């Protein structure tokens, strides 16, 4: 059995919590245990990957340091455009939305992305660039600004 190196990434090694949009605790401590385990969330992971909350954490809370939206635009043919929403504080990175929209550079997709940039009150938009394409930023920016 190759089970210890076949898959590097396990769901056991991350903290799951119902975080607050304005303040968050400043540190956490990790121990997977039957007290901390979730049992109701759907779980696609391989056998033994159990979703766990934190064990103990600080009582001191503050607002986050930085807030980013990330986009992977669709290429040739039909595929979903990917996106993600992340904040940071000290050594911790917080993940709050991931998903995708299907289409091209049509107004519906760009409208939805601009509304999503509005909804979480993000601070910077980041995207990948290749081949000297040069289109997507110039296309997207005049649509974003009204939101």
């Amino acid at each position: 059995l190759s089970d210890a190196e076949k898959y590097p990434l396990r769901l056991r090694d991350a903290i799951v919590c119902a975080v607050d949009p304005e303040r968050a605790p400043l540190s956490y401590q990790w121990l997977p245990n039957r007290q901390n385990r979730n049992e109701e969330l759907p779980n696609v992971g391989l056998k033994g990957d159990d979703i766990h909350a934190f064990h103990t954490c600080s009582s001191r809370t503050a607002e986050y340091q930085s807030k980013i939206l990330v986009i992977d635009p669709s290429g040739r043919g039909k595929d979903e455009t990917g996106y993600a929403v992340l904040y940071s504080l000290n050594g911790y990175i917080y993940l709050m939305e991931v998903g995708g929209f299907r289409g091209g550079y049509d107004d519906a997709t760009l409208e939805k992305l601009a509304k999503k940039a509005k909804q979480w009150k993000v601070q910077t938009v980041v995207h990948e660039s290749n081949f000297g394409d040069g289109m997507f930023g110039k296309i997207f920016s005049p649509i974003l600004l009204k939101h």
């Binding site: 091209g104 550079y105 000297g132 289109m135 296309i139």
Partner: protein, 63 residues
């Protein structure tokens, strides 16, 4: 993506597309700047309106 809608401009102006490509090529021939790679790999798509099919097959076999 269509930065410039050739069909709409063609219909409104009364100029065929085959002449718009000529207007572009004459301006390319007179310009003093050197061309870059993205300009060079998109010239056959404009020159292809001039060629007979028996010539375009030779261009394809060369490419």
């Amino acid at each position: 993506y269509e930065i410039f809608p050739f069909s709409l401009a063609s219909r409104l102006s009364g100029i065929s597309e085959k002449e718009i490509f000529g207007i572009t090529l004459e301006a390319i021939a007179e310009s003093p700047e050197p061309a870059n790679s993205d300009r060079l790999f998109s010239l056959p798509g404009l020159l292809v309106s001039k060629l007979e099919s028996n010539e375009a097959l030779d261009v394809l076999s060369y490419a």
